[PDB]
Design a protein around this ligand. Structure first.
Ligand SMILES: O=N[O-]
Ligand SMILES: O=N[O-]
Ligand SMILES: O=N[O-]
Ligand SMILES: [Cu+2]
Ligand SMILES: [Cu+2]
Ligand SMILES: [Cu+2]
Ligand SMILES: [Cu+2]
Ligand SMILES: [Cu+2]
Ligand SMILES: [Cu+2]
Lengths: 333, 333, 333
């Protein structure tokens, strides 16, 4: 009887950060209560000032990472304020039935709904809006995020021994299809409905104009670089709701990788790069061994360095000359 | 001595259905006799009336699913009637030698051939036509299907315990490259040879115009939706002879997935989405837990909902409110 | 203390061949010394005479395969002669820290550098140039190769038993983005810097003009076909530094495949086709069972047979009619 279970309210945080949780469940099964407010907003996605009408869960692209344990109940209050213009809904790939919830959560501006589902399968999973007849338009407007369903006993390696992260980040990767004029210039629009009228043609090229982490070119760089220390264990959850990606930590590895995101499977070891299919979340665990700057990319390097799918880590600590050293620094002789 | 083995004749059925077979082999090794007749035909592939010249095995796109057991012999009588205009052949990815059979099966209109191969490796496998110098043209005209080579003891899970399906469907996914005029309009042609003259240029864009299940937009919907009941175990075999796909059951999962199709490997568990590389067949097992409408898609949602890679299930039975429920239905307060 | 270890000098050979090595380490850990000389050169990449300015390690596309054992030290002397025009560097995906070495190896024309790293993880790995702000341009100009880090006890199967290859080949697959005029014609240029000015636009289409093995259409065919005999065990290492591929042996299989290249993981068995993500090396083991001509392709058959991602094997020996036979040769009746 679900009414006899504990309820716990979670307040979500902005990606790439992740709300506080326990890896190993410190209670029995609970109803975990989340609230997300839909926000349609203009967003500037590149250094040039290109503006799109983003469709967001909780004001961000991606939407925030939700975290529960296997056989918890997720109870989501989804709010569509009357300041918005479109109907929206939510499909959880973690959930079973009713198109992942999409059939039960259609909210017009000025409406709200509350969905409950049982998180029966452990893993990271995409969630995304999916209104009938407008599915790729909403997803590729940014209206997607992810949920992590941890095993109740936390993460385990390929031999059954604990894997415990010290830090967790959520990298949402977004393909955008900004329509162009005949010469190749990106259009701007006053409303999402105006933007929609060029959108299907732009999408059907299957060629994104931009591919970004955390909603913009350069978002995970500078003062917003990801951080770690030598010795620290970091889990990077990575989602792509619509298009394949191939994550790679430049100067590191995925020591343990669930490339398709599902923790009942043993992780792949020692990956350089891995394929997260479109419509999936994946997760990589790494223990840092060297300080300095890393880049974290989609390793189609055009998509990374020309279209925006690149972020940085800044890692503190002790350089290991056993692991790597410059024997003769660049010089002319 | 193969002449001492039983011969069994199979009559094939139209996809997405699958000819009757036994999961666990009820005889020893056999010579399993199949006949396929090649048919070049006009097909309408979308709601708009776009017509292509399809090159088919047995009148369908995809070609029918053939089913045998490991170490059976497949004996295929391939017929190319003189009503056709082109040379064709067949390459089985299940087979060993002679380009999978392609080097031994070149049939002009008015000819037939019979190929025999030993099915030495268990899995689902693509078969496709592959005439020298014209390979992608025939494949992307629809001339591809799949063969399932079951282990003699049937399917097993990641721990070695039986997996027994109640129902099986075959979803062939086809990328088409319909040539356009300068403004973007799709051309029609009177013959396959006329169509061929614009085909290489269209293919070289690497951008399909259409991506469909069972040969047309909407083919697996309406009166032709796939069906199941709550509690039923369903195996969905999915092939793509030329281009990657990423299958996803909207509102479900792949409980057990052989994403690259080969049953000596343990399946991946609890997949949301998986990557079937171009040139591969994959297979997903799911036990339905909720009634209602599901969609089954390529989860590049543009490819699904704009280009045609989407079908439906209609599932009967008892809704499970433990698994999912609307706590507060959409409303304004 | 690294100064107490043996040093061994390796002289590299041109792909698809691989320098001589021992599968099972016959010494303890060593410092393995390699020298590569950067060469910018014009290369003709197709049958039509299309010319690009290739940026090469050691004169070839791909760069040569380097082979060491786990916990050896790789010591690379990288030479950028003053006959070249650009700054280059090298990132090893096998290495840990400093962007895989890229941050420590920036060499102007007329300079050299020596990098040492510890090969702590077994597998095949991409290496590539990666100059800040010019990364995809150098990679997609051919400036990439691979390194194999063998386990000290050689390769093992999915049950822990030895896998010993008789022959090894390295297939580097290269996506090129040759800029076109308005009508679609490929441009030529006198220098790499002239070519660079159209390069970012060509890359941003995400649509290669050419996709080739060993640096040109048809490179691994004719007098340069790969060879084997019936019964021989062959390891094919395959890399793609920038873009996904899907290797397939036409008429064979990957009996054991590390599709993402890392030998601490059990191989996938009996693959028809597998996905090597862009930014990865993979490796397939096959024992030939039939003589004759095979093709080895990227199984996007357009990329194979129209854009150049196709090579051949010529295999000697005894045809096995149990495995495959023509029962009735093509004929009209
Ligand atoms: O490893 N980054 O190219
Ligand atoms: O789960 N379908 O977007
Ligand atoms: O198997 N080659 O299409
Ligand atoms: Cu929406
Ligand atoms: Cu979805
Ligand atoms: Cu054909
Ligand atoms: Cu094939
Ligand atoms: Cu370079
Ligand atoms: Cu790299």
């Amino acid at each position: 009887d679900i009414s006899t279970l504990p309820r716990v309210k979670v307040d979500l945080v902005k990606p790439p950060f992740v709300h506080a949780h326990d890896q190993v469940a410190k209670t029995g099964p609970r109803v975990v209560e989340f609230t997300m407010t839909i926000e349609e907003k203009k967003l500037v996605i590149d250094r040039e000032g290109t503006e799109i009408h983003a469709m967001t869960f909780n004001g961000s692209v991606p939407g925030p990472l939700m975290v529960v344990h296997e056989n918890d109940y997720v109870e989501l209050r989804l709010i569509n304020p009357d300041t918005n213009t479109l109907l929206h809904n939510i499909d959880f790939h973690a959930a079973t039935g009713a198109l992942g919830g999409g059939a039960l959560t259609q909210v017009n501006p000025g409406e709200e709904t509350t969905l409950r589902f049982k998180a029966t399968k452990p893993g990271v999973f995409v969630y995304h809006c999916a209104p009938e007849g407008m599915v790729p338009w909403h997803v590729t407007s940014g209206m997607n995020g992810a949920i992590m369903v941890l095993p109740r006993d936390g993460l385990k390696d390929e031999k059954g021994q604990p894997l415990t992260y010290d830090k967790i980040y959520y990298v949402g990767e977004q393909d955008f299809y900004v329509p162009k004029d005949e010469a190749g210039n990106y259009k701007k629009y006053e409303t999402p409905g105006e933007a929609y009228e060029d959108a299907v043609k732009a999408m059907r090229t299957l060629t994104p104009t931009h591919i970004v982490f955390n909603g913009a070119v350069g978002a995970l760089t500078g003062d917003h670089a990801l951080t770690a220390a030598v010795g620290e264990r970091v889990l990077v959850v990575h989602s792509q709701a619509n298009r394949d990606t191939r994550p790679h930590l430049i100067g590191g590895h995925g020591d343990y990788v669930w490339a398709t995101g599902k923790f009942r499977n043993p992780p792949d070891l020692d990956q350089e790069t891995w394929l997260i299919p479109g419509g999936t979340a994946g997760a990589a665990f790494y223990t840092f061994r060297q300080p300095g700057v890393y880049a974290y990319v989609n390793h189609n390097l055009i998509e990374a360095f020309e279209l925006g799918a690149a972020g940085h880590f800044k890692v503190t600590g002790e350089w290991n000359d056993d692991l790597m050293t410059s024997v003769v620094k660049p010089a002319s002789m």
